Structure 1
Amino acid sequence: VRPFDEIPGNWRNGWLNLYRFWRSNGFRNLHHIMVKNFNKFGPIYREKIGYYESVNIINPEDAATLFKAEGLFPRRLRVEPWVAYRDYRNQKYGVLLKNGEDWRSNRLILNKEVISPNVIQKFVPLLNEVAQDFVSMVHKQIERSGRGKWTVDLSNDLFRFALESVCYVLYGERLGLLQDNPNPESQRFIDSVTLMFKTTSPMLYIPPGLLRRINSKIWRDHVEAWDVIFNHADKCIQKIYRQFRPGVLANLLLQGKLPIEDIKASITELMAGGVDTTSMTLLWTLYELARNPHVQEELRAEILAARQQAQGDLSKMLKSVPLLKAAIKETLRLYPVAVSLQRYITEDIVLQNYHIPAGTLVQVGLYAMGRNPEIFPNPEQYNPERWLKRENHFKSLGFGFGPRQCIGRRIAETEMQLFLIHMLQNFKIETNSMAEVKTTFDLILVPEKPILLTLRPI
């Protein structure tokens, strides 16, 4: 086998690479940087930028060997800003920040009430309710606008649908974000959530302790945002104990399997993990459905057929939409919520004939895989057919893979399906202009400029 010190890449000028990363852009084009590296060093490259070093792969086969050596307690990179807040406020770590035995001990409890098929069917009526209210809002706006159209940037509205839905199944209450005049308690909560995501982007590389040392507003606004999010969790917890004398939070407080401190930590991290993720995916999807109207009709045809063969039963209808679940994989292929999965190797492995010493951070380039003509034929075309009647697990890594995969993947899928089912039944999504839209990096994959979509009743 080839030694580690022979892997291609730029690990020999890490300090010059740190200069090239911050001199211009860089923190906005990490997804484009990876593609170039793979198109320059091959199916595997080793990179070092400052004190950061890692081995990267693109072939789904290599992701196999990677996930087989992650260990019993897989460890990804950490969210420095989010961890810094828990240390400052002496809060417990949730299922996302924990590692080792504590994560495993938690994950298993959380899985019974978040990802198990038993509770997924209990979430269907809840998610569908929010999905029905979103369609009502779109009709109202279309009525006002006249001519039966509504050209709008659904960015903010989709963010509200994501937050409204996740908080419905987690806390067991409707925040009312989809109204025309939401109550100030929810308007301040969504603003705090938004400010929280907006303040993490800067501290993903800039050490949080450094911004705290200079009393930067970035650090202060971050703490102020998490405070509101944690206080809204206490507000719920208190109401639930008052009602003792339903939601994920209520069931965890009933079973009394985890401490309230560990329950409050996880319930919060669960919300953060699926508010910006589901919202942007639902946006990229609506965008590609408008650039590819043939796919939108093909889906609409299948959903209308499933509506009648199911006889109202959403459970049956959700099992009868294979092309819809394939469209979700297709969106996550061109626009992955995370440009890479990270796993700290716990055993010496070999990838592409190269010894990878234990402890090494190996990343799986999801954005580069989904756009490689080799792994995916016709990559730049949105064709959900490529996923049906095909097999492929290591090609659809959008929600990760393994014991520490996305614990809310079923909640996300269900929510995104119910959304598309209700939206395609009532409206046709038309692109205001066939002009190209560019992708940038900031926490996730977001469009450079707003996406303007027209919604006509059908």
Structure 2
Amino acid sequence: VRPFDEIPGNWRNGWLNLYRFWRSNGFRNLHHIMVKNFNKFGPIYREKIGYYESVNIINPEDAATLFKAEGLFPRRLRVEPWVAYRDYRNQKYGVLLKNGEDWRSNRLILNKEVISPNVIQKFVPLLNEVAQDFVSMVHKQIERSGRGKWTVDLSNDLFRFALESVCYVLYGERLGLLQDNPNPESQRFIDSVTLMFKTTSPMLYIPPGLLRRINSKIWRDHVEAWDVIFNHADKCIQKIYRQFREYPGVLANLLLQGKLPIEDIKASITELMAGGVDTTSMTLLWTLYELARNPHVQEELRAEILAARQQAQGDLSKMLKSVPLLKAAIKETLRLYPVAVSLQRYITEDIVLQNYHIPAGTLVQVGLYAMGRNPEIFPNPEQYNPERWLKRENHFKSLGFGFGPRQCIGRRIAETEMQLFLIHMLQNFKIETNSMAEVKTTFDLILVPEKPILLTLRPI
């Protein structure tokens, strides 16, 4: 076992690395920086940038050793701006922000109503409804444009789908974002949500307290956005308590069981919504882009989906269990375009990775973006081939939703929502890339295309 002060990397120039990070770009190419640090220092490197320091690994085997020492209450990197808001408004921490036994106490209660197979089946009809209204929207636009084609950047529309779907199952109501003229309350709500994400980006590395001290508009807009979101939750709590005197949605059932305080219920319902809007819509954007750029894969998925429709006789539950290549396509999209460039875990016990001593408490990150594009771990990584996941075994290769007790609590909701989306979309339309020109990726909260993706939709 080699000492901890011998791990390769640049940790010996933490202040020079901070200057190199902010002098130009930097906060836009964190995923590209991760690739080179692995291609220069090997399967493990130790990084220090200012007061930030971490050990990074890329091999799935190493990720297994890491997830075995996360402890009973695993802890990742915190969302500085999001926590700052709860402290400023004296709001409770949700399941995403909590730690220690407080997180586990809440996580176990939330799991029953968010990720258990019992409630997943109660969501399929709700999600399918939203997915049916999305296909209706596309048909209208194809009518307007004429010639049976609609070339458009779907970024905004997918964001609406993700937000409409998530809020349907969380609050039990349709915001109506997919209409041509949504009501003002829902338009201001989606604008607040959008503004909430736009202001969180500059405060990922810029201390929120500093922006608050100078009364920056970035901090004030962040507070105004979260205010609208938390108010909307109260509106749904008030309407539910009035209906009191079925009950669809996570919010209603949590208020009926009453196992968590309403304050802790308000906090978790809000962080659940924020965790599945940008993530789901972006993953769908990359999926549609890769399908249009790999039309052969699109036909294969369309073939399997159509077959599943007949062999199920309308039964959605049966149909969702008959689309293996569709679930593999989701994995293949999250391999090339992970919503999180890395998973983080604070070590609770001394471990050894690549014959190196890793002291307890050290922050260790699993570079998802570097793993997905390494030819060693994935042969032909740059090819979008969903078959590489079918009848192959992995687990520690498909870490898109994390792993362990503190994995993504919405994975099944997202997987269902994206499967139902692709099912309805591929049954109705063919997606074609306007031009096979290359689209580069950039970092900003998640992996987003540097420039809008123009896709063409034709009825089929």
Q: Same fold (TM over 0.5)?
A: yes
Which secondary structure state, in structure 2, belongs to the residue aligned with residue 394 of structure 1? coil
Q: Distance in 2 between matches of 1:443 and 1:24?
A: 18
Task: Write out per-residue CA displacement over residues 361-413 of structure 1, whole angstroms, 9 at most, x where no aligned residue.
Answer: 00000000000000000000000000000000000000000000000000000
Gaps of 5+ in 2: none
CA shift, 1:336, in A, is: 0.1
CA shift, 1:116, in A, is: 0.1
Q: Distance in 1 between matches of 2:423 and 2:447?
A: 24
Q: Please tell me whether residue 369 in structure 1 is matched to residue 355 in structure 2.
A: no
CA shift, 1:334, in A, is: 0.2
Task: Write out per-residue CA displacement over residues 190-225 of structure 1, whole angstroms, 9 at most, x where no aligned residue.
Answer: 000000000000000000000000000000000000
CA shift, 1:80, in A, is: 0.1
CA shift, 1:283, in A, is: 0.4
Task: Write out per-residue CA displacement over residues 58-109 of structure 1, whole angstroms, 9 at most, x where no aligned residue.
Answer: 0000000000000000000000000000000000000000000000000000
Q: Distance in 2 between matches of 1:59 and 1:101?
A: 30
Task: Write out per-residue CA displacement over residues 256-275 of structure 1, whole angstroms, 9 at most, x where no aligned residue.
Answer: 00000000000000000000
CA shift, 1:422, in A, is: 0.1
CA shift, 1:15, in A, is: 0.1
Question: How many pairs are equivalent?
Answer: 458
CA shift, 1:439, in A, is: 0.2
CA shift, 1:359, in A, is: 0.2
Q: Name which of 262, 281, 292 aligns with 2:294.
A: 292
Which secondary structure state, in structure 1, belongs to the residue aligned with residue 409 of structure 2? coil
Q: Distance in 1 between matches of 2:143 and 2:130?
A: 20
Q: Distance in 1 between matches of 2:243 and 2:419?
A: 33
2:309 aligned residue = 307
Which secondary structure state, in structure 2, belongs to the residue aligned with residue 421 of structure 1? helix
TM-score under structure 1 length normalisation: 1.00
CA shift, 1:330, in A, is: 0.1
Q: Distance in 2 between matches of 1:345 and 1:153?
A: 42
1:339 aligned residue = 341
Q: Distance in 1 between matches of 2:134 and 2:125?
A: 14
Q: Distance in 1 between matches of 2:282 and 2:249?
A: 24
Task: Write out per-residue CA displacement over residues 297-340 of structure 1, whole angstroms, 9 at most, x where no aligned residue.
Answer: 00000000000000000000000000000000000000000000
Q: Distance in 1 between matches of 2:253 and 2:267?
A: 15
CA shift, 1:353, in A, is: 0.2
C-alpha RMSD over aligned residues: 0.2
2:459 aligned residue = 457
CA shift, 1:11, in A, is: 0.3
Q: Distance in 2 between matches of 1:34 and 1:244?
A: 52
Q: Distance in 2 between matches of 1:26 and 1:261?
A: 38
CA shift, 1:136, in A, is: 0.1
Q: Distance in 1 between matches of 2:222 and 2:100?
A: 27
CA shift, 1:23, in A, is: 0.1
CA shift, 1:50, in A, is: 0.1
CA shift, 1:415, in A, is: 0.1
CA shift, 1:9, in A, is: 0.1
Q: Distance in 2 between matches of 1:238 and 1:39?
A: 55
Q: Which runs of 4+ in 1 moved over 4 A?
A: none
Q: Distance in 2 between matches of 1:101 and 1:7?
A: 33
Task: Write out per-residue CA displacement over residues 34-59 of structure 1, whole angstroms, 9 at most, x where no aligned residue.
Answer: 00000000000000000000000000
Q: Distance in 2 between matches of 1:147 and 1:35?
A: 44
Q: Distance in 2 between matches of 1:56 and 1:2?
A: 16
Q: Distance in 2 between matches of 1:288 and 1:365?
A: 22
Gaps of 5+ in 1: none
Which secondary structure state, in structure 2, belongs to the residue aligned with residue 162 of structure 1? helix
Q: Distance in 1 between matches of 2:350 and 2:335?
A: 29
Task: Write out per-residue CA displacement over residues 161-183 of structure 1, whole angstroms, 9 at most, x where no aligned residue.
Answer: 00000000000000000000000
Q: Distance in 1 between matches of 2:203 and 2:376?
A: 36
Q: Distance in 2 between matches of 1:289 and 1:213?
A: 47
Identity over aligned pairs, percent: 100
CA shift, 1:228, in A, is: 0.1
CA shift, 1:226, in A, is: 0.1
CA shift, 1:145, in A, is: 0.1
